[PDB]
Write an enzyme that holds these catalytic residues in place. Structure first.
Site, PDB file in Angstrom:
ATOM      1  CD  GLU A  83      -2.883  -1.360   0.041  1.00  0.00           C
ATOM      2  OE1 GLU A  83      -3.338  -0.310  -0.457  1.00  0.00           O
ATOM      3  OE2 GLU A  83      -3.161  -2.494  -0.406  1.00  0.00           O
TER       4      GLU A  83
ATOM      5  CD  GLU B 240      -5.896   9.029  -1.648  1.00  0.00           C
ATOM      6  OE1 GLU B 240      -6.499   8.626  -0.641  1.00  0.00           O
ATOM      7  OE2 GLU B 240      -6.465   9.342  -2.701  1.00  0.00           O
TER       8      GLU B 240
END
Length: 243
Positions: free
Chosen positions: A67, A89
């Site tokens: 991730e 992100e």
């Protein structure tokens, strides 16, 4: 405690390039923050056989390494040495708020992906904060500024079920048994089912998939550093996603 299964030297060899200057999260993810985060969750990395204990921190680190990976095919030391290169992100436009009476969005806050599991949305920050004792709804940014709450959110994800999905903890530690429907769907104990829990709707049940292969590459490399066998059922190429 978890430092009985993974040393500072092993953790740095695993997360070899996290502190290179090209990685956003340079200097954020420390062994110390990992250890402090793990003892808020009894059971993490201390359940089952010593082999299962080692497979748990390897699997946890493998999945969160995918991730946050910063590798590329020809990266130095291979693509599986570049996990934990990011803590948030970044390209996101959205605030990831779904108005909720149960987990209300805090004004002006954004719930984009942060930390090792890239925790997203107010309905995930809410229960995570409730569980670790900090109001993550009011201050989601704590997940990208405090490395031990960053790790705690990830471990919380790992340890918590989401019905019908078991927790990732329960399957790697041997405390989950597939129902008839799971067996009929090919979901049997092993690393592959954890991938299915995390992102199976996109990644599982349609043959070889590169993101699943990325997850497995980190798992194997971490298992080798820890000197434990991988177990079986490493992929989810023929398992139906959980429904």
């Amino acid at each position: 405690s978890v430092s009985s299964i993974v040393s500072r030297a092993q953790f740095d060899r695993m997360l070899l390039h996290r502190n290179d200057g090209a990685c956003q999260a340079k200097g954020f993810y420390t062994y110390d923050a990992f250890v402090a985060a793990a003892a808020a969750f009894p059971g993490f990395g201390t359940t089952g056989s010593a082999d299962a204990q080692k497979r748990e921190v390897a699997a946890f680190l493998a999945q969160t390494s995918h991730e946050t990976t910063g590798g590329w095919a020809t990266a130095p030391d291979g693509a599986f040495a570049w996990g934990y290169c990011f803590k948030q992100e970044r390209g996101a436009s959205s605030d990831y708020c779904t108005p909720s009476a149960q987990w209300p969005c805090a004004p002006g806050k954004r719930y984009y992906g942060r930390g090792p599991i890239q925790l997203s949305h107010n309905y995930n920050y809410g229960p995570a904060g409730r569980a670790i004792g900090v109001d993550l709804l009011a201050n989601p940014d704590l997940v990208a500024t405090d490395a031990t709450v960053g790790f705690k959110t990830a471990i919380w994800f790992w340890m918590t079920a989401q019905p019908p999905k078991p927790s990732s903890h329960a399957v790697i530690a041997g405390q989950w048994s597939p129902s008839g429907a799971d067996r009929a769907a090919g979901r049997v104990p092993g690393f592959g089912v954890i991938t299915n829990i995390i992102n199976g709707g996109i990644e599982c049940g349609h043959g070889q998939d590169s993101r699943v292969a990325d997850r497995i590459g980190f798992y194997k490399r971490y298992c080798d550093i820890l000197g434990v066998g991988y177990g079986n059922n490493l992929d989810c190429y023929s398992q139906r996603p959980f429904a």
